[PDB]
A and B are shown apart, each in its own frame.
Chain A
C-alpha cells in the first residue's frame, strides 16, 4: 500500500532537518544541559542579606561566568543560595561569595573571590558561610542628605 518512495524521500529529509534543527536549538541556543544540570555540581552559600540576588543570575569567579544561581530563599540568619557550577571549575575552600551589581540599572550576580586561589576545594553540597553585600543606595542617599543639610549655609 502506497510507499511511493518519493514521500519516503521527503519524510527522511524532513526527519534529518528536524533532528539537526532540534539538536542545534537544544544545545547552542536553549542550553538544555545547563538548565537541567548536566555536567555541573551543586553548591550552597549563606548571606547576611540577598543583596538583590535572584534565581537564574550568573555565578562568577573574578567576573567570568562559571555557573548559574538555581534558587535564593529567605532564612532566619539571612538568605540561602543554591547554585550549579560547571565541574570544569573548582573554587578554593577559602573563597567568599560577594553579591554584586554589574551597573547602576541592575543585573545582580554573585562572585566567588579567593585570595589564595589554591589548596583545598569545596565539595558538592557544601555551603559558603562567609559573604558580603554592597552598601545600599537608600542609606547612602539619606547620609548624603543629612550631611549636606547639617551645614549652616548662612555661615558659608
Chain B
C-alpha cells in the first residue's frame, strides 16, 4: 500500500528524469509550445497574463505586507530607518521563495494536472502509446523541461516585483526617504543569498512539476476525478515547497548566518 505507492511515485519520477534528453533531442517544438503555454497561461486565465499575472499580483501583495508590518512595528519601537534592511532579508529568507512557490504550484501545477487528467480520460495517453510514442517522455519530461526553462524568468520577475512593492509602500505610502531605504537595502543584501534563493526555487519548481505531473498522469474516475487529483496535488505541493525551503535555509545559514551588523 504505502510502500507500493512510494515505489510507484519513485519509478514515475525516475522514468521522467531519465527521459529528459530524449524529449530535448526529439520534441523541441513541443517543449517550446509548453514553454509559451506555461509562461502565458492557458484557457480563460491566459487572457489576463496567465502565470505571470498571478505571480506578480501575489508577490506584490507579499511585499506590501512585509513593508506595512515592518514599518509599523519599527515605528512603534522607534528604530524605523532599518525597514529596508528588514524587508530585503525577509524577501530573501522566507517570504518571496515560499510565496512564489505556492503561486507557481497553484497556477502551473494545477493547469498541468488538469491537462494530463483530461488527456488520460480522453484516451489521448492510450492514443500516444498505440502510436509507438513514449507517453511519459512526450508529456512529463516536456513539462519538466518547460518548467525548468520558465522558472528563472518567473522567479526573477517575482523578486523584482516584491522588491518594487516593498520599496514603493515604504517610500511613498509611508513617506520614507528613498536614499535611506536604498542605503539600508543595498548595504545588507548579499548577491550570494539571491543566487542560493534562485537555486532553491529551481529545485522547488522541478519537484512541484514532478508531483503535479504524477497526480495528473494517473488520473481516474472520469471528469470528476480530475478535481480530486488537483486538490491532492496542491496539498502535496504546499507541503513539499515549505519543507524544501526550510531544509535549504537550515543547510545554508546553519553555521554562518551571512550577516554582520555589530563588531
Contacts and interface: CB of A to CB of B under 8 A. Distances in A.
Give yes or no for direct A-B contact (beta carbon below 8 Å): yes
Interface of A: 1-3, 7-8, 10-11, 13-14, 17-18, 21-22, 24-25, 29-32, 35, 50-52, 54-58, 65, 101, 105-108
Nearest to A68: B187
B53 to A, nearest CB: 11
Interface string B184-223: 0011011100100000000000000000000000000000
Given A7-B36, A13-B40, A52-B263, A32 B191 contact: yes
Contact of B33 (A2, A29, A32): A2
Contacts of A32: 191
Contacts of B33: 2, 7
B263 A17 contact: no
B236 to A, nearest CB: 28
B156 interface: yes
Interface string B152-192: 01001101100100000000000000000001001101110
A67 to B, nearest CB: 13
A7 B186 CA distance: 39
Interface of B: 29-30, 32-33, 35-37, 39-40, 52, 79, 153, 156-157, 159-160, 163, 183, 186-187, 189-191, 194, 260-263
Given A57-B260, A65-B183, 13 more contacts: A2-B29, A2-B33, A11-B36, A14-B153, A18-B157, A25-B160, A29-B160, A29-B163, A55-B260, A101-B263, A105-B262, A106-B261, A107-B187
B262 to A, nearest CB: 4
A18 B158 CA distance: 11
Contacts of B262: 52, 105-106, 108
B191 A17 contact: no
A21 B260 contact: no
A40 to B, nearest CB: 15
A141 B156 CA distance: 49
A58 B261 contact: no
Nearest to B192: A35
B37 to A, nearest CB: 8
Contacts of B37: 7, 10
Nearest to B153: A18
A51 B261 contact: no
Contacts of A22: 153, 156
B39 A24 contact: no
Contact of A54 (B32, B183, B191, B260): B260
Contacts of B183: 65
